Design an enzyme around this catalytic site. Structure first.
Site, PDB file in Angstrom:
ATOM      1  N   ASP B 120      92.002  56.186  82.577  1.00 26.86           N
ATOM      2  CA  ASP B 120      93.110  56.867  83.447  1.00 26.86           C
ATOM      3  C   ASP B 120      94.302  57.522  82.632  1.00 26.86           C
ATOM      4  OD1 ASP B 120      94.391  57.305  86.008  1.00 26.86           O
ATOM      5  OD2 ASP B 120      95.833  55.919  85.986  1.00 26.86           O
ATOM      6  N   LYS B 122      96.541  60.414  81.585  1.00 22.90           N
ATOM      7  CA  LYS B 122      97.161  61.578  82.000  1.00 22.90           C
ATOM      8  C   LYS B 122      98.612  61.701  81.564  1.00 22.90           C
ATOM      9  CE  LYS B 122      97.749  58.437  86.387  1.00 22.90           C
ATOM     10  NZ  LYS B 122      97.217  58.310  87.781  1.00 22.90           N
ATOM     11  N   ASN B 125     100.973  58.820  81.996  1.00 19.62           N
ATOM     12  CA  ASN B 125     100.921  57.633  81.256  1.00 19.62           C
ATOM     13  C   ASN B 125     101.042  57.756  79.818  1.00 19.62           C
ATOM     14  OD1 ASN B 125     100.104  56.071  83.428  1.00 19.62           O
ATOM     15  ND2 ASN B 125      98.089  56.688  83.413  1.00 19.62           N
ATOM     16  N   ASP B 141      99.728  51.837  80.590  1.00 20.02           N
ATOM     17  CA  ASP B 141      99.116  51.771  81.774  1.00 20.02           C
ATOM     18  C   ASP B 141      97.318  51.451  81.494  1.00 20.02           C
ATOM     19  OD1 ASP B 141      98.547  51.250  84.757  1.00 20.02           O
ATOM     20  OD2 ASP B 141      98.346  53.675  84.930  1.00 20.02           O
ATOM     21  N   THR B 160      60.477  41.522  78.330  1.00 23.42           N
ATOM     22  CA  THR B 160      59.534  42.717  78.666  1.00 23.42           C
ATOM     23  C   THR B 160      59.824  43.306  80.196  1.00 23.42           C
ATOM     24  OG1 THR B 160      56.930  43.179  79.071  1.00 23.42           O
ATOM     25  CG2 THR B 160      57.929  40.957  79.920  1.00 23.42           C
TER      26      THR B 160
HETATM   27  N1  LIG Z   1     102.196  53.199  83.723  1.00 20.12           N
HETATM   28  C1  LIG Z   1     102.841  52.119  83.221  1.00 20.12           C
HETATM   29  O1  LIG Z   1     102.485  50.968  82.947  1.00 20.12           O
HETATM   30  C2  LIG Z   1     104.388  52.423  82.385  1.00 20.12           C
HETATM   31  C3  LIG Z   1     105.114  51.413  81.529  1.00 20.12           C
HETATM   32  C4  LIG Z   1     105.950  51.637  80.952  1.00 20.12           C
HETATM   33  C5  LIG Z   1     106.923  53.025  81.445  1.00 20.12           C
HETATM   34  N2  LIG Z   1     108.370  53.466  80.999  1.00 20.12           N
HETATM   35  C6  LIG Z   1     108.548  54.479  81.560  1.00 20.12           C
HETATM   36  C7  LIG Z   1     109.913  55.287  81.726  1.00 20.12           C
HETATM   37  C8  LIG Z   1     110.696  55.121  80.307  1.00 20.12           C
HETATM   38  C9  LIG Z   1     111.792  56.090  80.286  1.00 20.12           C
HETATM   39  C10 LIG Z   1     112.192  56.963  81.646  1.00 20.12           C
HETATM   40  O2  LIG Z   1     113.195  57.771  81.521  1.00 20.12           O
HETATM   41  C11 LIG Z   1     114.083  57.149  80.967  1.00 20.12           C
HETATM   42  C12 LIG Z   1     115.031  56.316  81.460  1.00 20.12           C
HETATM   43  C13 LIG Z   1     116.230  55.680  80.685  1.00 20.12           C
HETATM   44  C14 LIG Z   1     116.318  56.067  79.406  1.00 20.12           C
HETATM   45 CL1  LIG Z   1     117.785  55.348  78.363  1.00 20.12          CL
HETATM   46  C15 LIG Z   1     115.232  56.918  78.524  1.00 20.12           C
HETATM   47  C16 LIG Z   1     114.325  57.490  79.420  1.00 20.12           C
HETATM   48  C17 LIG Z   1     111.297  56.929  82.632  1.00 20.12           C
HETATM   49  C18 LIG Z   1     110.083  56.407  82.711  1.00 20.12           C
HETATM   50  N3  LIG Z   1     107.327  54.827  82.500  1.00 20.12           N
HETATM   51  C19 LIG Z   1     106.284  53.697  82.252  1.00 20.12           C
HETATM   52  C20 LIG Z   1     105.011  53.500  82.892  1.00 20.12           C
END
Ligand SMILES: NC(=O)c1ccc2nc(-c3ccc(Oc4ccc(Cl)cc4)cc3)[nH]c2c1
Ligand SMILES: NC(=O)c1ccc2nc(-c3ccc(Oc4ccc(Cl)cc4)cc3)[nH]c2c1
Lengths: 285, 285
Positions: B120, B122, B125, B141, B160
């Site tokens: 998956d 993309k 992820n 993910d 066989t």
């Molecule tokens: N598909 C998953 O299993 C998965 C696993 C872990 C993940 N972490 C984020 C993520 C991280 C940061 C984001 O903005 C930010 C928010 C706060 C700060 Cl201080 C910095 C960046 C948005 C999404 N998305 C994730 C998805």
């Protein structure tokens, strides 16, 4: 090594037949105990299946022991393996081929109806209910069986394939026809039963067994096949079809002329009630 | 609904980002908690994988909670999702495409080396380590991931094939190339990053998305691609190959000229030690 205490506590072990003969102490009845050394997956699966299914032409599980080895208690089939009936070019009378094959179809039909794929169909796994040649057959050995559901492909088809690879989209075309491998095996079995020899073998030939099977070009010996009917040969032709989607299903087979034989079917219905007599508990009227 | 006591006992839950921001009480450090409703299979699998793997460009699991829902504690990635960098035709500078893609390859290479297929891949992820555009990326993910072994086909090939069906023998030809689906996804990703638009879409076209993908005939817009190098375009061409066995592997990609860039690789080695500084425990000399 000895047998597990828990086993010896209910059963008296006997000869070998890995499968051994045993006697249930409580009933003094005979049972067949299959021993499997320690795999779990194939054993867990087989048990789960044996417990859920119940059908006249499908072996039933009576007890199970998880010890130094796996012990599976099954009902004993007096007739033994169908294999011993066809080994060394022994030829089964057509009328009995039909009687047997009908039951095999019903069984495999049943499995497929219930989302089960046997995957290891062969004379060695077809058991006869008695030493009579008119008897019940039961299918066994679900160690290599497959179960279906969700397929994940469905799960993927729900989403946009922007990032999806070509080979997977292509696979959509044929997805859902794994069960056809059983219908192939039956065709090969029915061929052996009818003629006494295997349709694809390395006996007197320069083409690889692989090529024979994929090309679908079986060994056809008229002398032997002259004794057999045209209807019977026709059904085999429609099961040994290379293209899985074109190959006959159990239903298509059960509808084939060669199987439209009331004498045979009657004889089947009679063999049933016979075995069910002992189990018959009085009914309301 | 509220959060499970056991979770609240170690973590202070915060905003949403299903993924929410949390603070580990013991350290006052930030963490990313992924919530998954109750599936078990895909969750069991993902956990088992996350625990076994450890690699700079692969997200690491810190804690896990099996409650009314599934809670997965992961390290927080300041940079967020790569998706937010390319949505709405945003075009990433080539030098950074390279820097990112290199890491992605290393990661997917690692997975494949360890018998794991992501399945998956993309932009959603792919996570960036910081708000800087020069940073570490980590893959995440693994809910749809596949693991390999025994394949059962091998198991069947040992016996066989007398009763074996043609379609299975045919499948031998291509067996063992499932991992190539990841290399396809990368190709599609690298295409987006480089050009700002997807290679297969239903935007202004009369051919079905399915046809585009299977034919491998992607949407090529010179105006946009004129800004991009020839080496970069060439690698994409070798990843978006319809024939799985002909398609590039991660290794073949890592060897491709476009990736032979010491400035980029250096910058990568530097971003590492930077993140590893805090973790650096004194070594023997
Ligand atoms: N598909 C998953 O299993 C998965 C696993 C872990 C993940 N972490 C984020 C993520 C991280 C940061 C984001 O903005 C930010 C928010 C706060 C700060 Cl201080 C910095 C960046 C948005 C999404 N998305 C994730 C998805
Ligand atoms: N593949 C299996 O999982 C399996 C499961 C159950 C099986 N039962 C036999 C069997 C039954 C009878 C045989 O001769 C006899 C022996 C004694 C008597 Cl009084 C009648 C027939 C030989 C083999 N083979 C089995 C295999």
């Amino acid at each position: 090594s000895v047998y597990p205490k828990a086993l010896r506590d209910e059963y008296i072990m006997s000869k070998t037949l890995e499968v051994k003969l045993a006697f249930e102490r409580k009933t003094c009845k005979k049972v067949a105990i299959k021993i499997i050394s320690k795999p779990a997956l194939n054993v867990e699966t087989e048990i789960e299946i044996l417990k859920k299914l119940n059908h006249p032409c499908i072996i039933k599980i009576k007890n199970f022991f998880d010890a130094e080895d796996y012990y599976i208690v099954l009902e004993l089939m007096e007739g033994g393996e169908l294999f011993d009936k066809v080994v060394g070019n022994k030829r089964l009378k057509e009328a009995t081929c039909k009687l047997y094959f009908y039951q095999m179809l019903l069984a495999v039909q049943y499995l497929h109806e219930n989302g089960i794929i046997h995957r290891d169909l062969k004379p060695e796994n077809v058991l006869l209910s008695s030493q009579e040649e008119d008897c019940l057959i039961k299918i066994t050995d679900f160690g290599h069986s497959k179960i279906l559901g969700e397929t994940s492909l469905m799960r993927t088809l729900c989403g946009t394939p922007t990032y999806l690879a070509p080979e997977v989209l292509v696979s959509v075309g044929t997805a859902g026809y794994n069960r056809a491998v059983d219908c192939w095996s039956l065709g090969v079995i029915l061929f052996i039963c009818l003629s006494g020899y295997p349709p694809f073998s390395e006996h007197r030939t320069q083409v690889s067994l692989k090529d024979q099977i994929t090309s679908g070009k079986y060994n056809f010996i008229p002398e032997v096949w002259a004794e057999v009917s045209e209807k019977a040969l026709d059904l085999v032709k429609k099961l040994l079809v290379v293209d899985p989607k074109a190959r006959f299903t159990t239903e298509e087979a059960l509808r084939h002329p060669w199987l439209q034989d009331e004498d045979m079917k009657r004889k089947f219905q009679d063999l049933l009630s016979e075995e069910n007599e002992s189990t018959a508990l009085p009914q309301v009227l």
